[PDB]
Ligand binder design. Structure first.
Ligand SMILES: Nc1ncnc2c1ncn2[C@@H]1O[C@H](COP(=O)(O)OP(=O)(O)OP(=O)(O)O)[C@@H](O)[C@H]1O
Lengths: 78, 83
């Protein structure tokens, strides 16, 4: 009558982490810095676009003025 | 000069209700040192793998650090294992 039976106990392997808290924090800090740099680039790019738009009008005005002056001088000369 | 090594463990036993816990707590009160660390026995076991050993080593971490810091002129640390 040496017929034995058993029961079982369970253990849980550690969840997936303990490497997600050293590279993670550095990743977040770098992401924040990149976000700030992107915001600054946004602002600078908008300012540059405004300045180019401003330049356009003066360019067109000088072109028109020179063309009209040349035509007038030619007309009077002949 | 003699250079003998001190004792580092005591085992109290006897029938129930004879003063073991009372004697231990009174001895703890007598000594002037860091507040003695008390373990209740079944409180070390954890379901995650490897955490029981970490819990055990957390008991001796402070004593080892103090012994390293001061050397042979360090204080005495008392540990009580109930049950
Ligand atoms: N020698 C004693 N003098 C005074 N009180 C005592 C003495 N021995 C036991 N007692 C009283 O017995 C009670 C319980 O004693 P204690 O807690 O030491 O039991 P124990 O030895 O730890 O028992 P167990 O085996 O259940 O852990 C306390 O109220 C304590 O005052």
């Amino acid at each position: 009558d040496m017929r034995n039976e058993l029961e079982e106990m369970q253990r849980r392997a550690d969840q997936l982490a303990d490497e997600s808290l050293e590279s993670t924090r550095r990743m977040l800090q770098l992401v924040e810095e990149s976000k700030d740099a992107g915001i600054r680039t946004l602002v600078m790019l908008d300012e540059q676009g405004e300045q180019l738009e401003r330049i356009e009008e003066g360019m067109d005005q000088i072109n028109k003025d020179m063309k009209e002056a040349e035509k007038n001088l030619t007309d009077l000369g002949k | 000069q003699m250079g003998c090594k001190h004792v580092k463990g005591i085992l109290l036993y006897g029938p129930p209700g004879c003063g073991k816990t009372l004697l231990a707590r009174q001895i703890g009160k007598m000594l002037n040192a860091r507040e003695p660390k008390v373990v209740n026995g079944p409180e070390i076991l954890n379901k995650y793998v490897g955490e029981s050993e970490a819990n055990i080593r957390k008991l001796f971490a402070d004593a080892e650090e103090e012994q390293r810091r001061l050397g042979a002129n360090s204080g005495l640390h008392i540990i009580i294992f109930d049950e």
